[PDB]
C-alpha cells in the first residue's frame, strides 16, 4: 500500500534529531514497555500475528495523522489492537469500552496472573526466532549480476516493494533463497514463499542524482522482471 509509512525519498521531514547514544533513552513511559510485552507476548503464541508480516500491515493501516503523532510504540499498540480484533481474539466494542475505562480512570488496577509455562513459551520465541526462510521446488528466475527492471505495481494490500524503487533498473547482488511472501502472509493468505534477492540500485537510476551513492534493497521475485 502506498501509505504514509513508505517515506523513502520524501522531502520535508527535516533534520535528524541527533542524540548521543548514551543519552538515547529507550522508554520514557511504562505503556511503551507494555507495548513491547504485548507484541512479543501475542506473537509468541500466534495471537493476532504469526510473524511480522501481519504486524506491519496493522501499522501501515493507521490513519496518517496517527502514524505521525502516536510516537513509535503507539504504532505497536495500534497493530496489536487491529490484529486482535481482525482475527477475533478481541471484540472491538469490549476493547473500546475498556479503553474508555482507563482513559477516565488511569489508575485502574491491572489484573495479576503468574504463568511460568507461558514465560518459557515466550522465551522460545525470543531465542529461537521466526525465520521466514523456506524451500520451493522452482528455480530462481534471476541470477547474480543480472540486470532486472522492477515492476510498476501498486498493491493495495501490504508490500515490501518501496515506491522509490519501483519501475527501476537494478542488478541482482545475491539470491538469498525462498522467503515467506509478505504481500500474501500479512493478509493470512498463506506463506506462499518466493525467491528473495538483494538488488543494487545506483543513485543516478533512483533519483537522477550525481554522487557515488547506491541503495541495496531486498526484493521478492514477483516485484521484478527480466530485461
Amino acid at each position: 500500500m502506498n501509505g504514509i509509512h513508505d517515506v523513502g525519498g520524501m522531502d520535508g521531514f527535516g533534520k535528524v534529531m541527533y542524540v548521543k547514544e548514551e543519552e538515547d533513552i529507550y522508554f520514557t513511559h511504562d505503556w511503551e514497555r507494555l507495548a513491547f510485552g504485548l507484541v512479543a507476548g501475542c506473537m509468541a503464541q500466534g495471537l493476532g500475528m504469526k510473524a511480522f508480516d501481519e504486524f506491519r500491515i496493522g501499522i501501515e493501516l493507521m490513519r496518517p495523522v496517527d502514524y505521525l503523532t502516536s510516537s513509535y510504540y503507539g504504532h505497536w499498540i495500534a497493530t496489536v489492537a487491529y490484529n486482535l480484533v481482525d482475527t477475533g481474539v478481541l471484540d472491538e466494542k469490549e476493547l473500546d469500552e475498556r479503553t474508555e475505562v482507563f482513559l477516565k480512570k488511569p489508575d485502574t488496577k491491572i489484573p495479576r496472573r503468574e504463568d511460568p509455562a507461558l514465560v518459557k513459551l515466550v522465551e522460545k520465541a525470543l531465542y529461537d526466532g521466526l525465520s521466514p526462510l523456506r524451500e520451493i521446488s522452482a528455480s530462481p528466475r534471476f541470477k547474480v549480476g543480472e540486470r532486472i527492471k522492477t515492476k510498476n505495481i501498486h498493491p493495495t494490500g501490504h508490500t515490501r516493494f518501496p515506491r522509490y524503487a519501483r519501475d527501476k533498473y537494478g542488478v541482482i547482488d545475491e539470491v538469498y533463497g525462498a522467503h515467506v511472501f509478505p504481500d500474501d502472509a500479512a493478509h493470512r493468505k498463506g506463506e506462499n514463499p518466493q525467491y528473495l534477492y538483494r538488488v543494487r540500485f545506483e543513485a543516478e537510476e533512483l533519483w537522477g542524482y550525481k554522487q557515488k551513492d547506491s541503495v541495496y534493497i531486498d526484493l521478492w521475485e514477483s516485484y521484478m522482471e527480466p530485461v
Binding site: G37, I59, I77, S214, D218
Partner: protein, 202 residues
C-alpha cells in the same frame, strides 16, 4: 470535531496509553497473557540485549584476522555460533567499511534492526527524517551526525526491506596500538554499527 475533518485530529498519546492498558487487562483476564510473560519481554529488550554484543563481534574481528574472514564469508553461521541469534536476528549480515566504501543501514518502511545483536534501534532510526532522507541524500544525513565523507568515498545504503538484517563493521581507528580486545570493544559505538559514525581515535 467537524465530521468533514476527523482526519485532522490525532489520537492523543493518552489514548495509546489507555489502549495499551485495555489490551493488557483484557488479554490477562482471558488467559492469553500473564504479568510475568509481559515482564519477561521487557527485561529481555530493555536489559538483556544491547549493542555490547555487536561491539564484542567488532572487537573480535579487529583482533582475530581468521575470525574476521569467517565472519565476512558467512556471518549467519558465525553469529549463531556466538549465540547472537533470536527474534529479528535470524539472518544477520555483516557489511565491512573500507577506505573507499561506507555502509549505512536503514529501514525505510518501518524500523527493522537486529535486536539479538544490537539491541533496540536509536530513537532517530525509527523516525521519518532519517528513513526518508538517508536513501536519497546520505551525505547530507551523515553530515548531521558529524560524518563528512569525501566525494570519492562510495556510500552503500542498505534498506532492510526483508527479514534479512545488516550490521556495519567499522574500521579500527588510529591510536589503538597495544589495546586488548576488551578495551577495543569499549570503543565500538552503536552508531558505528549502523554506519552513521566512524570510530574516533581514543
Amino acid at each position: 470535531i467537524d465530521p468533514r475533518f476527523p482526519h485532522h485530529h490525532p489520537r492523543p498519546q493518552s489514548f495509546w496509553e489507555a489502549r495499551a492498558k485495555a489490551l493488557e487487562s483484557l488479554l490477562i483476564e482471558k488467559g492469553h497473557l500473564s504479568s510475568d510473560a509481559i515482564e519477561r519481554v521487557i527485561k529481555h529488550y530493555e536489559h538483556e540485549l544491547g549493542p555490547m554484543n555487536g561491539a564484542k563481534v567488532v572487537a573480535k574481528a579487529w583482533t582475530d584476522p581468521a575470525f574476521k574472514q569467517r565472519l565476512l564469508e558467512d556471518s549467519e553461521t558465525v553469529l549463531r555460533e556466538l549465540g547472537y541469534y533470536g527474534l529479528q536476528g535470524e539472518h544477520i549480515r555483516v557489511v565491512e567499511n573500507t577506505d573507499t566504501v561506507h555502509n549505512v543501514v536503514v529501514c525505510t518502511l518501518c524500523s527493522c534492526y537486529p535486536w539479538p545483536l544490537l539491541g533496540l534501534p536509536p530513537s532517530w532510526y525509527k523516525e521519518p527524517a532519517y528513513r526518508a532522507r538517508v536513501v536519497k541524500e546520505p551525505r547530507q544525513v551523515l553530515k548531521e551526525f558529524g560524518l563528512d565523507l569525501p566525494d570519492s568515498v562510495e556510500i552503500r545504503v542498505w534498506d532492510s526491506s526483508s527479514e534479512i538484517r545488516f550490521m556495519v563493521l567499522p574500521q579500527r581507528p588510529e591510536g589503538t596500538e597495544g589495546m586488548t580486545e576488551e578495551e577495543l570493544a569499549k570503543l565500538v559505538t552503536r552508531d558505528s554499527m549502523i554506519g552513521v559514525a566512524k570510530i574516533e581515535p581514543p
